[PDB]
Amino acid sequence: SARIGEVKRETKETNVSVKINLDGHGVSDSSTGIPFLDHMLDQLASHGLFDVHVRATGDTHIDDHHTNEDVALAIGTALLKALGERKGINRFGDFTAPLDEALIHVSLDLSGRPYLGYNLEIPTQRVGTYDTQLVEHFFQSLVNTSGMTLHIRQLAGKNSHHIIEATFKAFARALRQATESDPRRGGTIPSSKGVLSRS
Amino acid sequence: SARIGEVKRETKETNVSVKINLDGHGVSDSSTGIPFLDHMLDQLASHGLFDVHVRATGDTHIDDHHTNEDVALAIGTALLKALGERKGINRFGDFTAPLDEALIHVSLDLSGRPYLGYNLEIPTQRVGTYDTQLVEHFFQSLVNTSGMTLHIRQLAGKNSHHIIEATFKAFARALRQATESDPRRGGTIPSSKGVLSRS
Amino acid sequence: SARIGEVKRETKETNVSVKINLDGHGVSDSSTGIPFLDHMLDQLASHGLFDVHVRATGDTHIDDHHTNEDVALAIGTALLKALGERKGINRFGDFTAPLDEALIHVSLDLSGRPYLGYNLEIPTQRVGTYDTQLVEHFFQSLVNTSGMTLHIRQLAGKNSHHIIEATFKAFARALRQATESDPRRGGTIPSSKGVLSRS
Amino acid sequence: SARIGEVKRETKETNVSVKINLDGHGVSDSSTGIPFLDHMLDQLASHGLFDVHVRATGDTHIDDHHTNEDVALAIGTALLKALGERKGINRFGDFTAPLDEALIHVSLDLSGRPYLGYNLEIPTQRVGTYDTQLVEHFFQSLVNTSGMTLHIRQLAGKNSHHIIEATFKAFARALRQATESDPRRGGTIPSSKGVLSRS
Amino acid sequence: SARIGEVKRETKETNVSVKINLDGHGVSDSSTGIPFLDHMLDQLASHGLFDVHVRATGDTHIDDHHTNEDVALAIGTALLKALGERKGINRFGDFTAPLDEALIHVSLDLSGRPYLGYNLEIPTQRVGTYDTQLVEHFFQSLVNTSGMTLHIRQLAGKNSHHIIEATFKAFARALRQATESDPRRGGTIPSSKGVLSRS
Amino acid sequence: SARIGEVKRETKETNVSVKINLDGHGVSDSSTGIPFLDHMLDQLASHGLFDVHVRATGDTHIDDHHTNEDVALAIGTALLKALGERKGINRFGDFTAPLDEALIHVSLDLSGRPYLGYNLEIPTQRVGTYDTQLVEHFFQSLVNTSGMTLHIRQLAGKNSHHIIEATFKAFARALRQATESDPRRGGTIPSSKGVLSRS
Numbered sequence A, B, C, D, E, F: 001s002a003r004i005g006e007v008k009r010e011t012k013e014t015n016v017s018v019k020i021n022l023d024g025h026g027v028s029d030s031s032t033g034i035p036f037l038d039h040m041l042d043q044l045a046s047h048g049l050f051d052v053h054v055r056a057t058g059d060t061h062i063d064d065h066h067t068n069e070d071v072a073l074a075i076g077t078a079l080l081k082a083l084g085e086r087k088g089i090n091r092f093g094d095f096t097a098p099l100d101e102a103l104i105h106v107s108l109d110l111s112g113r114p115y116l117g118y119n120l121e122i123p124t125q126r127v128g129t130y131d132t133q134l135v136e137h138f139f140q141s142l143v144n145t146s147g148m149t150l151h152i153r154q155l156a157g158k159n160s161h162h163i164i165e166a167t168f169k170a171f172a173r174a175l176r177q178a179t180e181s182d183p184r185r186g187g188t189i190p191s192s193k194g195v196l197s198r199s
């Protein structure tokens, strides 16, 4: 049966709803109020094969920050819920993807333990209307609620849209791999300590 | 009524029990299987005025790592449970404490959002039998489950025991401050967004 | 009786009204025409417990500069009026607050003597639509009319919104401390020279 | 039929027995007299899905060196025996795995030709009682008897236990991949020269 | 009952009398024969709320050194006597105070263990007739007899009078904090080892 | 009549007893629970000709730190008591001693004024089980209670045991010299100010 996580999250700053199917067919349905982020979430669906449903509204007149953050938090929680006990999964994901001159390595472990290693150097401040500082924050917030160890490494790149989009493509493929069933492990928990937890 | 958090946490590596009273009288009752850590937890009680009850066993024949980590995780969860909705608290804590030549600044925010900034340079590898790398890991794990933003800055120090112990003293006082009641805010949540959460 | 300062200030560039209660309950009521600034003033209320009422209009088609400046001037005057002779207060405030990876130290003295020490390095030029140069100018103008010695020190930070917001949180807490009653000094002026003045 | 390699190896320094199933279910059964090494061998089973049976005794009063070395030699021989002619396998393995802040890339070729490329910089001398120089020696000895080309690259890391354990996790996954059946090659030897040999 | 320490100290170089009330109302009554020092002691009273009574005479025709030193020694002894067993106190003090462009951080621990960490760089040799080397010596001598761990850190400053005076203001506030009653600790000794002593 | 100082000192961490005869015959009787320290105290007796009786127990399961410190404190107090008014003594001591390649200069003044200047660079972290950071702490604590100005300068050395032991030999000889009777001064106090005191 498909692993689906659903989240509603609201504060005085933002209102967010997320539904993610780990066992999806790449259904893309993201509307965050941040068009560039929507385009990136579309890569998560197209390349990760997640079904990604996101709705957000928020205080974008202040800046895109709170929206971006709260979307990421809610996505991370949806991943946590869908993953459950993490029985029988690959756990680890590793993929390097390009977009033209950009080349980004993503490695992750669905350990339960939040950590972000990130070294992107995005050479412009705005891609469309999107503040490029928010990319790091998206991943940081997502790892915090999902209980993910995540490394993002820039191997090459100059165009900011290419750098960011290659990151999402690599992330999508690494996350797909990690969430997928391990065909040899017979449904067992993939941990020598017998459990995977965010606590 | 006193804010008390209780946690039991067990894996194939370790077995941990924690009870913390935020509104304590400094009752010290820590036995982790790591004597140096016990001594540090005793500062948390003595200077923070938390009642700190900790029991742990684990795979110390491998190394103190898993025990140290899992104690920290469980303490963080106990803090999270005791704090609840975080209504009426100071939220922020800030304190710099010495131990002789050592001087350590600790600043924290009980935001719900885990983050550790840490720059200690502990010049020896073992204090007694305790691996000095485990200090950073203790705080990292604790912030992750407690939902704490924490900065630890070494301003001076040479003796490893002094550096580490001053850190725990400063942390204890900053955490005390942050967890204490704000006498002017009338029980309100100390956040412009109306909520403080680890999600 | 509550210490309240009220200011109306108008030029050909801007029109500003401010009312601040030093002895407030954190009532937030700021509308400057600069949404990011409103969000920052909201931290001043939430964390400083000032009641902050601000209205401004101005020549934002030129840039946010004159508005930002004139709001700050008027706030400083409101603080000066509310403070009066400064009898019985703590006078000094000192607080370091984080926002995730950002960490900002604010120290101030309600001496009457305007001074700003500031070393923020905000790595992007715009947070939303807000020009990040205007942060320094806000504090500079505020100290000039309030008669405040103010130091703002960036200890850590990368995200521009985090850096700026941590600054306002630290400032709010330091200003709260400084303006609050000193419970031991018996209503006396906190100065060896017998007076505190902007002249 | 499952590919199983069994080795008994004894000198005046050590006594070692190894049994490895390449086509295992992750059965972990390692007791080397070096607890940290046992914990690492447990990752080899848990993540590589090898059945790993190891027993060793030896001159640990001198140091763990001879034991560590001779265990590695015997494991390498067991791999060589189990692999046989290396018909129909993937041959190459490539995986990057993290453990929190640590990130280690392992690439290997089951060519028959021993080579170790290794650049770990493990910042402490002892993890528990285990001498961290012995990690490099473990892999060097293993490649020598197994006939493996192996590269181990530290991409990130600070905690010695994390660095070493991430290495074993990445190694386990790369070795799993390399030893597994290539579903398209129809049982053929994966070499343009028609043979894979340690001679 | 108020904690008062009284000292008479005389040598062939100097004659000194000190009386300090830890629980004072800021009574300033210092006449050392060194006017600049008197002005600084006046800050100790005004901002620390100590009652400070000092009389000294000495060999100022040689230089202010012996007087400055012996005043400091006697003040430290008076603090030691007044503090007694140090039951129920905060123990630690931490405060950063400015004077215009100067900004000085003082952190102290009333541990019993004398230590001075000091990094002031006072850019002129004389403030009035007062030799600016004597500032460091004042604090060094004071810590030695009081049994105080003391750190003084220059964060900013150019004017020598500002640097020195900000130091005394910060020191006064940190010492006030440390000597004050801890309202939660119920009169207990604030030390995990059960005693605070200069021996 | 022989100058003998006796001290009992106990906390929750340690229990210490010291008896020192300044006018001894080199009777060595030290048992601190730290064998390396005992060996060093034996040099103090053998080369200084002090009769040195020390007993300590303490929390060595945490580390040797508290024991080492408290032994030093108690020895310093015993020296202070035995020295009394310091009439008729040499006061100053100066000696440089080698141990093979190591060469250590010790200069001291029995002034009453505690100060340690120390520049040893001991190239290993443990000599036997003894943490080499504790050497500096031993001397620092000793000067604090004895009222000694002490300089320790490493002129040469590589072997940690040689460096430390040469330090104790030089210290022993310098202290012997300083404590011995000045045969020309006729019992007078060796100070132009007419008194030597720790206050």
Ligand SMILES: O=P(O)(O)C[C@H](O)Cn1cncn1
Pocket (backbone or CB within 6 Å): A111, A190, A191, A192, A193, B065, B066, B069, D161, D162, D165
């Ligand atoms: O990665 P896991 O949790 O499956 C097993 C590890 O042994 C736990 N660990 C966490 N830090 C060091 N080791």
Ligand SMILES: O=P(O)(O)C[C@H](O)Cn1cncn1
Pocket (backbone or CB within 6 Å): A065, A066, A069, B111, B190, B191, B192, B193, C161, C162, C165
């Ligand atoms: O600190 P908070 O959550 O009370 C309010 C902040 O506005 C939320 N925030 C988080 N990142 C930037 N802003």
Ligand SMILES: O=P(O)(O)C[C@H](O)Cn1cncn1
Pocket (backbone or CB within 6 Å): C111, C190, C191, C192, C193, E161, E162, E165
């Ligand atoms: O800070 P104050 O004004 O209370 C007293 C100072 O002595 C005045 N001052 C100003 N510059 C140097 N000293």
Ligand SMILES: O=P(O)(O)C[C@H](O)Cn1cncn1
Pocket (backbone or CB within 6 Å): D111, D190, D191, D192, D193
């Ligand atoms: O990797 P192989 O042995 O399958 C084929 C290679 O051509 C052999 N070789 C070894 N060095 C250079 N080439």
Ligand SMILES: O=P(O)(O)C[C@H](O)Cn1cncn1
Pocket (backbone or CB within 6 Å): B161, B162, B165, E111, E190, E191, E192, E193, F065, F066, F069
């Ligand atoms: O600061 P204290 O004396 O309350 C307790 C410390 O454990 C004693 N100590 C002194 N050096 C290292 N530890």
Ligand SMILES: O=P(O)(O)C[C@H](O)Cn1cncn1
Pocket (backbone or CB within 6 Å): E065, E066, E069, F111, F190, F191, F192, F193
């Ligand atoms: O060394 P003493 O105490 O005998 C005499 C000195 O004159 C006192 N002194 C202390 N600092 C400077 N001089």
Ligand SMILES: [Cl-]
Pocket (backbone or CB within 6 Å): none
């Ligand atoms: Cl600082």
Ligand SMILES: [Cl-]
Pocket (backbone or CB within 6 Å): none
């Ligand atoms: Cl790479």
Ligand SMILES: [Mn+2]
Pocket (backbone or CB within 6 Å): A065, A069, A137, C100, C162
């Ligand atoms: Mn944020």
Ligand SMILES: [Mn+2]
Pocket (backbone or CB within 6 Å): A039, A161, A165
């Ligand atoms: Mn695109």
Ligand SMILES: [Mn+2]
Pocket (backbone or CB within 6 Å): B065, B069, B137, D100, D162
């Ligand atoms: Mn770990």
Ligand SMILES: [Mn+2]
Pocket (backbone or CB within 6 Å): B039, B161, B165
């Ligand atoms: Mn201690």
Ligand SMILES: [Mn+2]
Pocket (backbone or CB within 6 Å): C065, C069, C137
């Ligand atoms: Mn302007």
Ligand SMILES: [Mn+2]
Pocket (backbone or CB within 6 Å): C039, C161, C165
């Ligand atoms: Mn915000």
Ligand SMILES: [Mn+2]
Pocket (backbone or CB within 6 Å): D065, D069, D137
């Ligand atoms: Mn070897």
Ligand SMILES: [Mn+2]
Pocket (backbone or CB within 6 Å): D039, D161, D165
């Ligand atoms: Mn492990």
